[PDB]
Swiss-Prot record:
Sumoylated. Residues 7-83, 87-163 form the RRM domain. The modification Phosphoserine is found at residue 15. Residues 84-163 are annotated as: Globular B domain. Involved in the packaging of pre-mRNA into hnRNP particles, transport of poly(A) mRNA from the nucleus to the cytoplasm and modulation of splice site selection. Plays a role in the splicing of pyruvate kinase PKM by binding repressively to sequences flanking PKM exon 9, inhibiting exon 9 inclusion and resulting in exon 10 inclusion and production of the PKM M2 isoform. Binds to the IRES and thereby inhibits the translation of the apoptosis protease activating factor APAF1. May bind to specific miRNA hairpins. (Microbial infection) May play a role in HCV RNA replication. It comes from Homo sapiens (Human). The gene is HNRNPA1. It is found in: Nucleus; Cytoplasm. This is Heterogeneous nuclear ribonucleoprotein A1. Identified in the spliceosome C complex. Identified in a IGF2BP1-dependent mRNP granule complex containing untranslated mRNAs. Interacts with SEPT6. Interacts with C9orf72. Interacts with KHDRBS1. Interacts with UBQLN2. Interacts with PPIA/CYPA. Interacts (via the RGG-box) with the HOXB-AS3 peptide; the interaction inhibits binding of HNRNPA1 to the intronic sequences flanking exon 9 of the PKM gene, preventing inclusion of exon 9 and promoting inclusion of exon 10 which suppresses formation of the PKM M2 isoform and promotes production of the M1 isoform. The chain holds residues 8 to 181 of 372 of the full protein.
């Protein structure tokens, strides 16, 4: 079974009227939920406006994020994977032979790409062996950076969030 941390979505922006039960009924549409909690004040029991769900598999997490925007009890919520919410990554170790279509063909299966920037030397124009990819949405980056490995154009690349 995949580590539970990778099966969790933190849900921000909840309606204060959302409950464990109503959050579960909503998010069960996209997979089996092993956990579903609305965070509440320990004294007043008033909702703190966020919670989390835990799916049985990572593919269910994917399915849930692909079904965004989620309107839950009348309010659009903000689901994010557990870990810095950015849309850009640094891709290192691609050397001089890696081109734009290599990066695009690989990274477009993580999300919609808006910019690919292959870095070149300011003086010579030679490729410097790293690039930046900007996506239209943060979940692409979140999926990317929790992988142990990235292989592009035969290279094992180092990939991290970029600000
Ligand atoms: C380790 O990642 C975490 C851990 C705790 C948290 N707490 C939160 O407030 N969760 C969120 C609400 C909406 C989106 S993120 C977030 N991310």
């Amino acid at each position: 079974k995949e580590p539970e941390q990778l099966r969790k979505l933190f849900i921000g922006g909840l309606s204060f009227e959302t409950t464990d039960e109503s959050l579960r009924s909503h998010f069960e549409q996209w997979g089996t939920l092993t956990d579903c909690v609305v965070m509440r004040d320990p004294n007043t029991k008033r909702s703190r406006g966020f919670g989390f769900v835990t799916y049985a598999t990572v593919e269910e997490v994917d399915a849930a994020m692909n079904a965004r925007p989620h309107k839950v009890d009348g309010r659009v919520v903000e689901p994010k994977r557990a870990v810095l919410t950015v849309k850009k990554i640094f891709v290192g170790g691609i050397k001089e032979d890696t081109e734009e279509h290599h990066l695009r063909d690989y990274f477009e299966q993580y999300g919609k790409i808006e910019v690919i920037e292959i870095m070149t030397d300011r003086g010579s124009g030679k490729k410097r062996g790293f690039a930046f990819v900007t996506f239209d949405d943060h979940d692409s980056v979140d999926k990317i950076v929790i992988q142990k490995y990235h292989t592009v154009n035969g290279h094992n690349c180092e990939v991290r969030k970029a600000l």
